[PDB]
Amino acid sequence: ASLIERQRIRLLLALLFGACGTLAFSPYDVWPAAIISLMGLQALTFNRRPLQSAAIGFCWGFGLFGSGINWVYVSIATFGGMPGPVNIFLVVLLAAYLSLYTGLFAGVLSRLWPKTTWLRVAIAAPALWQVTEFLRGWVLTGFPWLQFGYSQIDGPLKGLAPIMGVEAINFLLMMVSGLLALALVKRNWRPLVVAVVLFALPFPLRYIQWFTPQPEKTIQVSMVQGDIPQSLKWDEGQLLNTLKIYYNATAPLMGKSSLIIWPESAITDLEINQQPFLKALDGELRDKGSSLVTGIVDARLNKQNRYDTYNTIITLGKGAPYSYESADRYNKNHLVPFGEFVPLESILRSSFSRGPYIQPPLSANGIELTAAICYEIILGEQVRDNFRPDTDYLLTISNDAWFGKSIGPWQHFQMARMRALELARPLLRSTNNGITAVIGPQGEIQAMIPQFTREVLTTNVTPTTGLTPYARTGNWPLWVLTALFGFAAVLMSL
Numbered sequence: 065a066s067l068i069e070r071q072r073i074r075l076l077l078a079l080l081f082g083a084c085g086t087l088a089f090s091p092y093d094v095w096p097a098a099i100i101s102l103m104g105l106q107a108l109t110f111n112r113r114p115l116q117s118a119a120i121g122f123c124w125g126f127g128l129f130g131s132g133i134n135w136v137y138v139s140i141a142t143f144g145g146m147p148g149p150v151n152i153f154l155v156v157l158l159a160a161y162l163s164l165y166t167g168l169f170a171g172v173l174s175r176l177w178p179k180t181t182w183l184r185v186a187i188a189a190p191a192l193w194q195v196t197e198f199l200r201g202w203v204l205t206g207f208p209w210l211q212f213g214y215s216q217i218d219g220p221l222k223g224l225a226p227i228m229g230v231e232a233i234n235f236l237l238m239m240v241s242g243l244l245a246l247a248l249v250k251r252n253w254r255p256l257v258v259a260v261v262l263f264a265l266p267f268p269l270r271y272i273q274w275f276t277p278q279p280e281k282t283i284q285v286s287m288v289q290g291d292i293p294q295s296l297k298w299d300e301g302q303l304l305n306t307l308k309i310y311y312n313a314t315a316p317l318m319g320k321s322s323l324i325i326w327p328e329s330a331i332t333d334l335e336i337n338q339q340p341f342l343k344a345l346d347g348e349l350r351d352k353g354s355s356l357v358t359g360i361v362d363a364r365l366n367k368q369n370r371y372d373t374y375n376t377i378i379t380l381g382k383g384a385p386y387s388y389e390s391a392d393r394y395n396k397n398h399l400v401p402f403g404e405f406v407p408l409e410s411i412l413r414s415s416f417s418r419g420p421y422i423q424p425p426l427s428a429n430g431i432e433l434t435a436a437i438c439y440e441i442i443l444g445e446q447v448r449d450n451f452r453p454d455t456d457y458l459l460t461i462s463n464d465a466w467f468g469k470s471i472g473p474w475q476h477f478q479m480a481r482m483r484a485l486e487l488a489r490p491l492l493r494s495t496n497n498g499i500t501a502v503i504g505p506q507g508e509i510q511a512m513i514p515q516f517t518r519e520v521l522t523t524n525v526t527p528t529t530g531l532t533p534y535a536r537t538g539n540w541p542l543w544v545l546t547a548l549f550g551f552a553a554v555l556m557s558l
């Protein structure tokens with residue numbers, strides 16, 4: 065009845081529609097839940113004072129992030145060793161912090177566009193959503209987790225991503241959901257019909273093959289899922305076991321896999337301390353026709369006699385002869401706040417160093433791979449900026465053990481697939497215990513191995529070539545459209 069007119073009621077409803085969005089993502093993968101959840105955000109903010117709407121937008125995001133990233137509890141409650149009730153409160157406060165952007169969005173849109181209009185709902189709303197999600201992903205090194213475009217990796221809007229990137233899918237979903245909500249509140253069919261047409265219009269885009277496979281460059285790839293337990297992962301007494309596990313999994317594959325991939329910091333020891341093992345492995349790999357790509361930590365003495373410690377990938381074997389001075393390596397550029405550095409260096413009473421934002425592809429046995437470590441693979445623009453036309457495969461390596469048996473590693477994995485569709489290359493993804501797989505150049509799963517197991521994924525994979533429209537332009541076409549919408553929307557209501 066008029067129960068829905070009560071602000072506190074709209075806030076409770078905001079939690080449910082918000083938390084409903086978590087179902088859009090992996091493993092749930094009910095992509096219609098994203099439109100449900102966005103319709104709630106669009107409708108529940110109608111006809112509210114701007115500060116009430118900002119609260120509703122806040123409470124909507126608290127349902128999303130509260131239900132969707134509460135897996136960070138495992139990382140927190142294990143990495144930083146605090147009481148438990150306290151690690152719960154940290155997860156709340158992170159879910160609260162992210163919900164500020166979703167409260168910012170609702171407040172500004174209520175303030176600038178108070179009327180229940182298609183202008184507010186289809187023009188202002190997605191342009192403002194483009195900006196607020198941008199800030200959520202940039203401020204304090206950002207956290208653009210749970211963006212609804214990723215739930216379309218297997219959906220009808222798929223074919224938009226090679227054109228304009230996953231954020232164009234975000235933009236269209238907010239638009240389509242706004243007119244659906246507008247139609248229901250104002251019981252009018254015109255925004256319903258528009259919402260359908262716009263939702264259907266990208267459907268033929270998934271028929272466009274932007275890439276050309278290179279069957280002559282097809283190689284066999286192995287990725288060793290070592291399954292080194294996080295409680296023992298960096299124990300300074302079982303490096304030998306880790307070294308024996310990965311080596312013994314790799315030796316029988318030499319001469320048969322052109323490319324072998326060990327996950328993030330597989331070698332759990334400084335690169336400078338492992339020269340005899342690395343020099344020895346390199347010659348063996350080269351003696352066979354094989355090449356190895358592995359993560360490792362490099363504490364590198366700088367010019368100033370201090371140490372820069374990097375999260376790195378190194379290359380050995382055929383076509384990439386190992387050398388501590390080699391240029392065939394990649395240093396992680398985007399570091400995990402708290403996990404890899406203390407955010408805000410203004411304090412005083414350690415922290416990884418960063419590699420450059422743009423780095424050349426690694427080269428192993430004649431194959432060029434564009435690398436990302438851990439959740440770097442979710443930074444669509446950073447990946448596209450490192451991508452080169454001569455790239456053969458996308459490569460990401462990750463240790464998802466920090467998130468345990470939750471929906472975390474599935475969300476991470478879904479986002480990495482979006483990169484394969486966007487730049488239309490295969491994605492090689494290599495992890496410690498979770499979600500090691502090969503993604504085809506259209507985001508399909510070509511191969512995966514089960515989580516929490518010690519084994520190697522071995523399969524043939526064909527490099528592709530050609531440039532998608534998004535690989536040629538990055539994010540700037542969508543920004544121009546959001547500036548046009550923003551300029552246009554603001555011009556009327558101002």
Ligand SMILES: CCCCCCCC/C=C\CCCCCCCC(=O)OC[C@H](O)CO
Nearest residue numbers: 139143157158161329400401402403404466
């Ligand atoms: C500004 C307000 C924010 C609100 C408060 C938020 C607090 C929780 C945030 C992050 C938890 C840390 C996650 C740590 C996950 C571990 C990742 C990691 O450490 O991986 C690299 C490894 O350590 C090297 O090999």
Ligand SMILES: CCCCCCCCCCCCCCCC(=O)O
Nearest residue numbers: 080081083084086087131132134471
């Ligand atoms: C009328 C509102 C419709 C929405 C119905 C409620 C859906 C709630 C979301 C359920 C699952 C969300 C994920 C929580 C599980 C987790 O934290 O791992």
Ligand SMILES: CCCCCCCCCCCCCCCC(=O)O
Nearest residue numbers: 068077107108110111179180249250
């Ligand atoms: C069982 C609850 C499910 C439905 C929840 C959605 C309620 C949305 C309320 C829309 C607000 C509209 C109030 C007046 C707006 C207008 O006509 O301008």
Ligand SMILES: CCCCCCCCCCCCCCCC(=O)O
Nearest residue numbers: 182186235236239243254255258262
């Ligand atoms: C990326 C999305 C497509 C963008 C195309 C540019 C112009 C489309 C704007 C949407 C029109 C919405 C009008 C609704 C009509 C109504 O309310 O009856």
Ligand SMILES: CCCCCCCCCCCCCCCC(=O)O
Nearest residue numbers: 268269270271272273274275505506
């Ligand atoms: C009413 C019946 C029509 C049935 C559908 C016929 C036309 C659909 C076109 C399908 C093309 C799929 C393209 C896949 C992408 C690729 O080629 O890599």
Ligand SMILES: CCCCC
Nearest residue numbers: 204205401407408
């Ligand atoms: C904007 C400075 C980075 C601290 C998280």
Ligand SMILES: [Cl-]
Nearest residue numbers: 297328329463
């Ligand atoms: Cl690790």
